[PDB]
Design a protein around this ligand. Structure first.
Ligand SMILES: Nc1ncnc2c1ncn2[C@@H]1O[C@H](COP(=O)(O)OP(=O)(O)O)[C@@H](O)[C@H]1O
Ligand SMILES: Nc1ncnc2c1ncn2[C@@H]1O[C@H](COP(=O)(O)OP(=O)(O)O)[C@@H](O)[C@H]1O
Ligand SMILES: Nc1ncnc2c1ncn2[C@@H]1O[C@H](COP(=O)(O)OP(=O)(O)O)[C@@H](O)[C@H]1O
Ligand SMILES: Nc1ncnc2c1ncn2[C@@H]1O[C@H](COP(=O)(O)OP(=O)(O)O)[C@@H](O)[C@H]1O
Lengths: 424, 418, 436, 407
C-alpha cells in the first residue's frame, strides 16, 4: 500500500537517448549530464559481461545524487543482476576478520541461475514395519535397508521403496496412517499433522537465482540431514572463515562443471562500496589483489570528501581517502554542482512523487532558501509545510506556511553561527 | 555456449617465455619488455623447478605501473601443473580468530607438499547383473552371478556378499558404468549416455596422488572435512607438529615410500606489515623445511607498521639482507604501444594506429594502467558508434569523461572538504 | 630419498678437541673462538644437569650467523636432550594467552625418558573356542597366530577381546598387536577366496613373513607439555558421534594448582620407581627484544623457578624502544631487569679473509667446486656489501654455469649475475629519490 | 635418577630461620643479612600464622638485588606443607578470554583454605569369586563378604574378575583398580578418620555442573558475583556457626607490581575492604614509574589512594663482607670447592657487577674446572670465564660502534 517514501523510490532509468545523448529532464533525473553519460558506458560494461575487476569511483560535493545515480544503475540493469550496497563501516566485525567480509562481498555480488529438476512423491502414506536392529556381523536376519511405503493418490496407489536413513529421519517426526507426506530426492522431511492430486511420481524444473556467497555458507554447513549436523543446525555457528581453496578453487571448479552442461548460467554482480574514505588501509591492501582478480565483479565507490588522512597511517594524507596506488586503479568520475534553476525544478519534480500540490511562489521561495544554505534542507521542509497546510485547512502550500516552518527549524549554518558562544 | 570466464587484468598473459640461452624475447607468451626481470624470473623459475634447494627468498622491487605483479603471474602460470603454489596478501594474515603468526606458518604449511606413490585395483567397464538375491526362504549368502563386458574382452564372475549392500544402495542397471574399488567406495558413471564400453577386462590403476601438508589437520582434528572447508578453530597445538608430524614425515622420507615437493609462496603488498611477521619470516626460512617464496613491494621507503622508524623499501634491514632484491625498470615508449596492441588482440579490440599514437602519448604522460582503463571504455563507445574500428575522437571523448588522478588533482580547488 | 641440503647442513656441531681449545675452522664453523668456548661451556652445563633455570644470551650484529651456532649447540647435545626453537612472534595467540603459551613452552623443553620393551604379535588370527566359561561373560581368550616362520598361541583378556571386537574381525586374518595393547586390525588380510568370487573387496595381501613374536627395545621420550595437555583433556575420540563434533578444542589455559601438582607427583613416583628418567630441555628464543614487557616480567619470574629449564636468548639489534612502553629505551631491546642475570656471549663480525673460506665451505657443501678467480671476486663482492649476498649468490652462479654448459664457475658468471640481482644496499641507493 | 626439583636461584634455601625473640641469625637456612627485612617478615609471617584479621597488604621497597623474591620464597617454605600458597606474576592475570577482575578475584579466593573433618570407612582389597558371596583377600588377612541381589545386577554389567583390587567406601563409593600384584595393604575392615583440607574451589564446583573438567584447567570465565557472596558466604557462614569446618588463611604474593592496570588498583580497594581476603605481599623493583594506560608519576608505580593501604618495609644493599659469606653458602649447592684466593676475585667482580653474575661465575667456572681435570677451581679458571662471559656494564662499552641502530 504505502511505499514509506524513501525519497529514492522513484526512478526508471538513466534517461539516456538511444544514440547516447543525455536528456535534460528524463525519468525524474535532471542534471549531471557528464555523470549519466559516464555511467552509460558502465551499464554497457556490466551488460557486456566480458570484462571484470574494474572499479569506478564517484567524486563530488555532498548531495550531488551519486547514490541515487547508482540506484538508477541497479534499476536499469534489472532485477536479475544483483546489487549489494555496503559502507566502509560495515566490514568491521568481531566474529569475522576485516578482510573476509570484503572477500565474500564479491561472492554475494555475483549472481547465479540454476535449473534444478526434482522428483516429488506425494500421497497417503501406508507403512508396514520398521527396520529391525542387527547384531554385529553374523548376517542377522536380512530385512534391512528396505522400507516398504505405499502411497494412495487420486490417480492410484503405488508402493515405493525407501532407504533406512530416510525412515530413520522420519521416525523422529510424528508419523500416522492417512497423512499427506511430501517425499523428494533431497531427503527432505515435509509432513502435515492432522490431515493429493496428480500422479504418484512427479518431476518439475525449479529455476532458482542464488548468489555465490549463499552457496559458500550453505556449502560450509550442510542442511543437517544427519543427527549431529542437525544439532549443528539447531546451534548456529556465529561466523567462520572459509579457506581460499574451498571459496575459490573447488566451488569455481564445480560451477565450471555446471557451465559446460548448459543448465546453470552465471551472471556478474555489482558491488557498491559507499563512504570508502572511512575504510581501513588493510581493506585497500587486500583490495589491490581483489581488483586484480579475474573473477571479481565490477566495484563502484563513492568519495564524500576531497582529501583525508589514510586510516591507520596518522601521517600521510591522500585525496579522496584513497591511496595513490589504489586511486590509479579506480576510474574517477566528476559530478557537476546543481544550479538554483535545476534546484527549483527538482523541488517540483520531488513534489510530484510526494503527492503534494505546491504553488509556484512557494517553489521559488524554497529554491531561494535552498540556494542560501542547502538543497537537502528544502527537501526536508516539504512535509511540515503541507502538514501545517492541512492543519490550517489550506488546500495547497503557501509562502506563509514555508515561512513559519522555516522559522521554527533553525538552519545548520545558522545553528553553526549560534554555536561556539563559549557559554555553559 | 560460452565458458562464462571473464578476463581479468593479469589473465591476458599465459606462461612465461624463456630460452635455453636465457635470452628474453621481445614478446614471449604475452610478456613484453623487462628483459632483466625476465631473465631473473627465468633463473629463479629454473631454480624453483629444480627442487634441489629449499628455504631461499627472492624479493622483487618496482615502481607502481612497471608490471611487477604480472611477472609473478607469468611465473605462476609457467610453474607447471601439479606444483603447489600459494598466493597470499599482506593484510590477509590479520585475523581475530587466529594469530598472524599461526596464519603465516599456515601459509608456509600450505606451500610445501608431499607426493606418495600408491597402487590400487580398480575395475572399469559396464555392468550386466541379474539379481535373484532379493527373494529368499531363509537366510543365505544370496551370491548370484555377474556379467561384465569390455571392449578388450568380457568377464563373468559371481557377486560379492559384502558389497551387495553398496550394490543395492547405488543405482545399478543394464549397461551402466560402475567402478568397484579396493577401498570399498562408491564411484559410478552414466551408462545411458555412452550406451545410448571402455577399459579392460582386468586392469589395475596406479595413480600417484600428491598429498598436501594439510595431513597435519586431519591428524590433529577429529574430522578432516570441517577444518579443510573452513578455518574453524585455530592451528595445531605446539610441539605436536614437530614431534608427530616430523616423526611421521621422517618415516615417509628416506624410505622411498614418499617424496617432499617444496612449493612457492607469494605475498602481495608486503610494504605495510607488522614487525612480528617480518621477524617470523627469517626464522621460518631458516627452518629445515621451508618453501621458496617471492614477495612484491610497489612502494618505496616507508615506515613499517608497529614502529615509528622508517625502514628502507618498507622492510627492515634484517629481512632485506636475507633475500636478494630484483629491481624492475619502467616500460619504454616503444614497448607501451606493443602492450596496447597485445591488449587489443587479447580483448578483441580493433583500433587505428593514430589511436595507438595518441594513446601512447597518454601512456607517456599518465600511467599505462589508466590507458588500459581507457581502451575498455572506448571499445563500448565504438560499439555505440556501430563502427568496426575505434577512432581517435571516441577515445578522446572517453578521455574527456573519465579523468585521471593527475587530471582531477587540479579540480580540488573547490575546497569541498578538508 | 634426498636431504636436498635443507637450510644449512654444513654444521655438524662444535666438534672441539678434548683439550678444550677451539680450532680456527672446525666442522664447517670458522672463527668465533670466544663464542665457540662460550657455547662450549653451556653444553657442558646442560649435560651436567646440575642447574635449572639458567639463561644464555647471544649478542651480535645481524649476519654474524649466531643462529647456526645455536644449531651447533643443538647438534652437540644430540637427539637425547629435547631442543625446540621459539620465535618471538608466536607468543601472541588469540585463544591461548601469552603467559600460558610461554608456560607451555617451558613445559615443552623438559621431557621424560621411558625405556620400554616392545612385544609385537602379528599374523593370521585363528580364534579357538574359549575354555573358561560358567554369570558367564568371557574372562579368558585364546588366539592362535600362524606365520611362515612358525605358529604360536597367545592368551588375552576379555577387555582386549572387546578392543578387537570393536572393529570387524574374522577367522584367518592378519592382525598386529603391541605391548601397549593397541592392535591394528584388517578384515580379510590373508589371501583366500573360498567364496568362488573375488568381489569380497577388503584388502587382499599375501601371508606376511617373519616370526610371530618380535622383541624390541624402544626408548621413548615424551615432553611434559604433551602430558599436561593430554591429561588435562579427556583425550577421548571416536567413541561418540555427538561429542567428536561438539568439542571445538578451544585450548583454554590450564590451572597451575591441580595440574602441575598432579603431574609433578605422578612423574616423581614414576622416576622413583625407576621406570622413567627425567631429562632437561633447551629453549632457544629468537627476537627476544620484540616481546611485550609483560612477557619480560613474567619471563624472569618464570625462569627464577626451580622447575624451569635452561633458556637461550638472542639479541639481533641494539638499543631500541621497549615494546609497549613507547617511552623508556633500553639496550639490546631488553629492560635492565631481565638483562641482568642472563649470561652475555660476544659475537663479532668476521674479517674479510674468512669470506672466501665460508663461501668455500658452502660451495663444497652444495657439491659444486668453484675456481679460485670466482672465489676471489665473489669474496670481494661478499666483503664489499655482506656475506649473505655472496652466500645466496653462490647457487645462481652454479645455475648459470650449468646452463651455459661449464662444469665450474668462472668470474664472468658471478660478475655477470651480480648485476642482475641487486643487493639491499644498492637497492636502497636507487630508492629515496621520491620518484613515481 | 633426577627429580623434578632441581638446584636453582631461590631453590637453595629451605625455610626461614626464626627465633623465639624474633632475632634473625647471621646464617640461617642459607640467608645472611637483611635483619630488618627478616624481622619484619617474621612479624607479618606471625600475623599470617595467627589469622586474627584479613585484608592486609605488605609492600617491600629497596634497590634491585636485595633479595625481594628470596624473602617471599623463604616465607613460602616456612609456612608449612599442606597449606594454600599462591604467588603469581603481574602478567599472569592478563587474559584475552577472561576479564581482568576474574583473574585477581580467583587469585584472592584460591589462597583461602577450608578445613573439613569427615569420618568415612574404606573397605578395599582383592576379589575371589565363589558361587553371590565374594571372598575379599589381602596380604595381612582374608575375609568373606556376602552379597545380596542388589549388587549382582550392578556387577554383571561392570567388568569384575578374580584378583582385581576393588575399593568400596561406606559413602557408597565404588572404585575399580588394577590388580597391581603380578604386574593390597592394610586391613579390609577399617574405620578411617581423615581431615580433608579443601580450597575455595567449592565456588567452582557449585557454579559449574561438573568439577572434573574445571579442576584440571582454568576453564570458565568470571563466575556470577552474587553466587560468590550470598550462596558461598552463606554456606561457609552456616558451617562456621555449626562448627563443622574451619577456614585457614593463606598468603597471596604478587611480584613486579610497578606495572599494572589502574583497574586492578581500583579493585584492590574493595579487595582489601572485603570481608574475607588473604594478606598481600607486594614487591616493587622500581621507585617511580608511569602507570600503564595513563600519564602519571607516583612512587612504586601505584596510585596514591592504594599507597596508604600497604605496609612498606625498606631493604639495604648487601655489604662486601657478607657477599663472600653468601657465596660460601652457594658453594655448597653444587658441592664444588673453591680456593681461598678465589673468593677475593669473585667478590671483587661482585663488587662492580651484579651479584647474580658472581653467582653464575662459580657454576660456569666449575665446568672449565672439569675440563681441566682438577678437583678444585683455580683463579685462572674464573679469570678465563670472566673473559668468556662479561657483565652488562662491560658489554655496554662495546656497543659504542652503533653500526646498525635500527632507528
Ligand atoms: N539528478 C537528480 N535527479 C533526481 N533526484 C536527485 C538528483 N540528484 C540528487 N537527487 C535527490 O537528492 C537526494 C539526496 O541525494 P544524496 O544521496 O545526498 O546525493 P549524494 O549521494 O551525491 O550525496 C536523493 O534522495 C535524490 O532523490
Ligand atoms: N609484460 C606485460 N605485457 C603486457 N601487459 C603487462 C605486462 N606487464 C604488466 N602488464 C600490465 O600491467 C598491469 C598490472 O600492473 P602491476 O603489475 O600492478 O604494476 P605495478 O607492479 O607497478 O603495480 C596489468 O593489467 C597488465 O595488463
Ligand atoms: N662459524 C661459521 N662459519 C661459517 N659459516 C657460518 C658460521 N656461523 C654462521 N655461519 C653461516 O651463517 C648462516 C646463518 O646466519 P644467521 O645466524 O641466520 O644470521 P643472523 O643471526 O644475522 O640471522 C648459515 O648459513 C651459516 O652458513
Ligand atoms: N639474604 C640473602 N641470603 C641468601 N641469598 C640471597 C639473599 N638475598 C638475595 N639472595 C639471592 O639473590 C638472588 C637474586 O635475588 P633477586 O630476585 O634479584 O632479588 P630482588 O628481587 O630483590 O632483586 C636470589 O636467587 C637469592 O637466592
Amino acid at each position: 500500500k504505502t511505499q514509506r517514501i524513501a525519497s529514492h523510490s522513484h526512478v526508471k532509468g538513466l534517461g539516456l537517448d538511444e544514440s547516447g545523448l543525455a536528456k535534460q529532464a528524463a525519468s525524474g533525473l535532471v542534471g549531471q549530464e557528464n555523470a549519466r553519460e559516464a555511467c552509460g558506458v558502465i551499464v554497457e560494461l556490466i551488460k557486456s559481461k566480458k570484462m571484470a575487476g574494474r572499479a569506478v569511483l564517484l567524486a563530488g560535493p555532498p548531495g550531488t545524487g551519486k547514490t541515487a545515480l547508482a540506484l538508477a544503475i541497479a534499476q536499469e540493469l534489472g532485477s536479475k543482476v544483483p546489487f549489494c550496497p555496503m559502507v566502509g563501516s560495515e566490514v568491521y566485525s568481531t566474529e569475522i576478520k576485516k578482510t573476509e567480509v570484503l572477500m565474500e562481498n564479491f561472492r554475494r555480488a555475483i549472481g547465479l541461475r540454476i535449473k534444478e529438476t526434482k522428483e516429488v512423491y506425494e500421497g497417503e502414506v501406508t507403512e508396514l514395519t520398521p527396520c529391525e536392529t542387527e547384531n554385529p556381523m553374523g548376517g542377522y536376519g536380512k530385512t534391512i535397508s528396505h522400507v516398504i511405503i505405499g502411497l494412495k493418490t487420486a490417480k492410484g496407489t503405488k508402493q515405493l521403496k525407501l532407504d533406512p536413513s530416510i525412515f530413520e529421519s522420519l521416525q523422529k517426526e510424528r508419523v500416522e496412517a492417512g497423512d499427506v507426506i511430501y517425499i523428494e530426492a533431497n531427503s527432505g522431511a515435509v509432513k502435515r499433522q492432522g490431515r493429493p492430486k496428480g500422479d504418484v511420481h512427479k518431476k518439475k524444473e525449479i529455476i532458482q537465482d542464488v548468489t555465490l556467497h549463499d552457496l559458500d555458507v550453505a556449502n560450509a554447513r550442510p542442511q543437517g540431514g544427519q543427527d549431529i549436523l542437525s544439532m549443528m543446525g539447531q546451534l548456529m555457528k556465529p561466523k567462520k572463515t572459509e579457506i581460499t581453496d574451498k571459496l575459490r578453487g573447488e566451488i569455481n571448479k564445480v560451477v565450471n562443471k555446471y557451465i559446460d552442461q548448459g543448465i546453470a548460467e552465471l551472471v556478474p554482480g555489482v558491488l557498491f562500496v559507499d563512504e570508502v574514505h572511512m575504510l581501513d588501509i588493510e581493506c585497500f591492501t587486500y583490495l589491490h589483489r581483489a581488483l586484480e582478480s579475474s573473477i571479481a565483479p565490477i566495484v563502484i565507490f563513492a568519495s564524500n570528501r576531497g582529501n583525508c588522512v589514510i586510516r591507520g597511517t596518522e601521517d600521510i594524507t591522500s585525496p579522496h581517502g584513497i591511496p595513490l596506488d589504489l586511486l590509479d586503479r579506480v576510474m574517477i568520475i566528476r559530478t557537476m554542482l546543481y544550479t538554483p534553476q535545476e534546484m527549483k525544478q527538482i523541488i517540483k519534480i520531488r513534489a510530484q512523487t510526494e503527492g503534494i500540490n505546491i504553488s509556484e511562489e512557494a517553489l521559488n521561495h524554497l529554491g531561494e532558501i535552498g540556494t542560501k544554505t542547502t538543497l537537502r534542507y528544502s527537501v526536508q521542509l516539504l512535509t511540515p509545510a503541507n502538514l501545517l497546510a492541512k492543519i490550517n485547512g489550506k488546500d495547497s502550500i503557501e509562502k506563509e506556511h514555508v515561512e513559519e516552518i522555516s522559522e521554527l527549524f533553525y538552519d545548520a549554518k545558522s545553528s553553526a553561527k549560534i554555536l561556539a558562544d563559549q557559554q555553559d | 555456449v560460452t565458458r562464462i570466464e571473464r578476463i581479468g587484468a593479469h589473465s591476458h598473459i599465459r606462461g612465461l617465455g624463456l630460452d635455453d640461452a636465457l635470452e628474453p624475447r621481445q614478446a614471449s607468451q604475452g610478456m613484453v619488455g623487462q628483459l632483466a626481470a625476465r631473465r631473473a624470473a627465468g633463473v629463479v623459475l629454473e631454480m624453483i623447478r629444480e627442487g634441489k634447494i629449499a628455504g631461499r627468498a627472492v624479493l622483487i622491487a618496482g615502481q607502481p605501473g612497471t608490471g611487477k605483479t604480472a611477472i609473478a603471474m607469468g611465473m605462476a602460470q609457467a610453474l607447471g601443473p601439479d606444483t603447489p603454489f600459494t598466493a597470499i596478501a599482506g593484510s590477509e594474515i590479520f585475523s581475530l580468530e587466529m594469530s598472524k603468526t599461526e596464519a603465516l606458518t599456515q601459509a608456509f604449511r600450505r606451500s610445501i607438499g608431499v607426493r606418495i606413490k600408491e597402487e590400487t585395483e580398480i575395475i572399469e567397464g559396464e555392468v550386466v547383473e541379474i539379481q535373484i538375491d532379493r527373494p529368499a526362504t531363509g537366510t543365505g549368502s544370496k551370491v548370484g552371478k555377474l556379467t561384465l563386458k569390455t571392449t578388450e574382452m568380457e568377464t563373468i564372475y559371481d557377486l560379492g556378499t559384502k558389497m551387495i549392500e553398496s550394490l543395492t544402495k547405488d543405482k545399478v542397471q543394464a549397461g551402466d558404468v560402475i567402478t568397484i574399488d579396493k577401498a570399498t567406495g562408491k564411484i559410478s558413471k552414466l551408462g545411458r549416455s555412452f550406451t545410448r564400453p571402455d577399459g579392460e577386462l582386468q586392469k589395475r590403476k596406479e595413480v600417484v596422488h600428491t598429498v598436501s601438508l594439510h595431513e597435519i589437520d586431519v591428524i590433529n582434528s577429529r574430522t578432516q572435512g570441517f577444518l579443510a572447508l573452513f578455518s574453524g578453530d585455530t592451528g595445531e597445538i605446539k610441539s605436536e607438529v614437530r614431534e608427530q608430524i616430523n616423526a611421521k614425515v621422517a618415516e615417509w622420507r628416506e624410505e622411498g615410500k614418499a617424496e617432499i615437493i617444496p612449493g612457492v609462496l607469494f605475498i602481495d603488498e608486503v610494504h605495510m606489515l607488522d614487525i612480528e611477521s617480518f621477524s617470523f619470516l627469517n626464522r621460518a626460512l631458516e627452518s629445515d623445511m621451508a618453501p621458496v617464496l617471492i614477495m612484491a613491494t610497489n612502494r618505496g621507503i616507508t615506515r613499517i607498521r608497529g614502529t615509528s622508524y622508517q625502514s628502507p623499501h618498507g622492510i627492515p634491514i634484517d629481512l632485506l639482507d636475507r633475500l636478494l632484491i630484483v629491481s624492475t625498470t619502467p616500460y619504454s615508449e616503444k614497448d607501451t604501444k606493443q602492450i596496447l596492441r597485445i591488449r587489443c588482440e587479447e580483448e578483441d579490440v580493433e583500433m587505428s594506429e593514430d589511436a595507438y599514437t595518441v594513446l601512447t602519448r597518454i601512456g607517456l604522460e599518465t600511467s599505462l594502467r589508466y590507458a588500459i582503463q581507457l581502451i575498455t571504455a572506448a571499445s563500448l563507445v565504438c560499439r555505440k558508434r556501430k563502427g568496426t574500428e575505434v577512432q581517435v575522437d571516441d577515445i578522446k571523448r572517453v578521455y574527456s569523461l573519465f579523468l585521471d588522478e593527475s587530471r582531477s588533482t587540479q579540480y580540488m580547488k573547490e575546497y569541498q572538504d578538508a
